[PDB]
Design a protein around this ligand. Structure first.
Ligand SMILES: [Ca+2]
Ligand SMILES: [Mg+2]
Ligand SMILES: [Mg+2]
Length: 430
DNA sequence: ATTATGACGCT
DNA sequence: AGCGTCATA
């Protein structure tokens, strides 16, 4: 009772750009704004692979991973923007730079952990205390929360969505105890006020819209964020957890979307996150290991302790290309030419990295896939990375993988390579 | 013939 | 170290 920690110690947000690559392209080309549109890479094979989709286009059933030709069957007027190509491969620089724009804005408000090219966790705990002292027991106006949903509300005794949103928000605010600087619900609420401000600043200064989740930890924040998209934010309180989890498929929780989540369902014979509460910590540990077992026991109760790491910059810089089906590399000349193209992009990105961020990578990781293997990577090998020179890097990469060539002939390569990957890692200050 | 990434766990 | 898992545009 009095000694059970409830995982209400922090306020954590997760900010996620809406259809991010699409917005980057729409900002640049106003003709694409407010239309069904998608971003595609390459174009010759089935019109190109779709990697991002506007909300207008999703309404027609267009999705990521769909071939553009097939998307056009669902959405004939679908508009397309193509990822830039350089050195014969997709080049994602425009999106990486747009991401930096957003991350630098977020960093003005609080410490952020860059979770992906378009999302960051924010630890608001400190910022909330501060704001709480400026407010001095002042109630929080619904006006300060114009895009916020309160998960689980309204309840009890509204035909249209904005009306529901507001009814829910009013119930929440009318119940709030602002007299108490340590109420976790109040802290979450102040968190949401800050996130409205952050989101306003991002949109003002970049033109990009985003959604966000505000809760007591990263898993709940991430889940919350997806509840109302696009261009909205969702507060998931500790109290909302039991109802929310009672019908929440296990696979929806971050880290449970793959094989572990599949085994939780299979081994325990359950479907929903809430059903986990009926097992002891020991039981969960026996099936899923000490760490996972402990994590699951706490998580199904809405509790998680993973910190927002103070890290705004990626830890690795990598360049990758697939060579699918008939394009698999089958000669030594080919392999060396593409290792060079990858190495040239990598050098360019590394040099800029060193200038902007005062660090140097020290390890080069080389990875390939061979025709047949259904794994992302067939083989990984690292070497020293002593100079930012593409010719040297490609030469070193060739050296570490060349023994993979089955071909008895020097000039031929077998089995053919269907993927090449160069990654710079292990940065040190400079 | 989704592709191009990126973080982190296990042994 | 090299491999696997899980994630996102
Ligand atoms: Ca997004
Ligand atoms: Mg995202
Ligand atoms: Mg997405």
């Amino acid at each position: 009772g009095p000694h059970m920690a409830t995982g209400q110690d922090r306020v954590v947000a997760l900010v996620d750009m809406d259809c991010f690559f699409v917005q980057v392209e729409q900002r640049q080309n106003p003709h694409l704004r407010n239309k069904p549109c998608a971003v595609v890479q390459y174009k010759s094979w089935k019109g190109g692979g779709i990697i991002a989709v506007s909300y207008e286009a999703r309404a027609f059933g267009v999705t990521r991973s769909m071939w553009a030709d097939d998307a056009k069957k669902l959405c004939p007027d679908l508009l397309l923007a193509q990822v830039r190509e350089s050195r014969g491969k997709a080049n994602l620089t425009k999106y990486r730079e747009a991401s930096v724009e957003v991350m630098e804005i977020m960093s003005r408000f609080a410490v952020i952990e860059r979770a992906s090219i378009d999302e960051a966790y924010v630890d608001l705990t400190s910022a909330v205390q501060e704001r709480l002292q400026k407010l001095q027991g002042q109630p929080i106006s619904a006006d300060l929360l114009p895009s916020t949903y309160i998960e689980g509300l309204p309840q009890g005794p509204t035909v249209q969505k904005e009306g529901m949103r507001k009814q829910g928000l009013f119930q929440w605010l009318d119940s709030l105890q602002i007299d108490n600087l340590t109420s976790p619900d109040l802290q979450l609420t102040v968190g949401a006020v800050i996130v409205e401000e952050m989101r306003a600043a991002i949109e003002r200064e970049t033109g990009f819209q985003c959604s966000a989740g505000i809760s007591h930890n990263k898993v709940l924040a991430k889940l919350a964020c997806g509840l109302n998209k696009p261009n909205r934010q969702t507060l998931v309180s500790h109290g909302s957890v039991p109802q929310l989890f009672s019908q929440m498929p296990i696979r929806k929780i971050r880290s449970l979307g793959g094989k572990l989540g599949a085994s939780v369902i299979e081994i325990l014979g359950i479907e929903y996150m809430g059903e986990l509460t009926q097992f002891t910590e020991s039981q969960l540990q026996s099936h899923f290991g000490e760490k996972n077992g402990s994590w699951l026991y706490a998580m199904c109760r809405g509790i998680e302790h993973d910190p927002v790491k103070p890290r705004q910059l990626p830890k690795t810089i990598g360049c990758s290309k697939n060579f699918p089906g008939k394009t698999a590399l089958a000669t030594r000349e080919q392999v060396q030419w593409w290792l060079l193209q990858l190495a040239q992009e990598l050098e360019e990105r590394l040099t800029k990295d060193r200038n902007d961020n005062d660090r140097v990578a020290t390890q080069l990781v080389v990875s390939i896939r061979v025709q047949g293997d259904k794994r992302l990577s067939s083989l990984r090998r690292c070497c020293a990375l002593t100079r930012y020179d593409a010719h040297k890097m490609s030469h070193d990469a060739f050296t570490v993988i060349k023994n993979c060539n089955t071909s008895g002939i020097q000039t031929e390569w077998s089995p053919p390579l269907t993927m090449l990957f160069l990654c710079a890692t292990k940065f040190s200050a400079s």
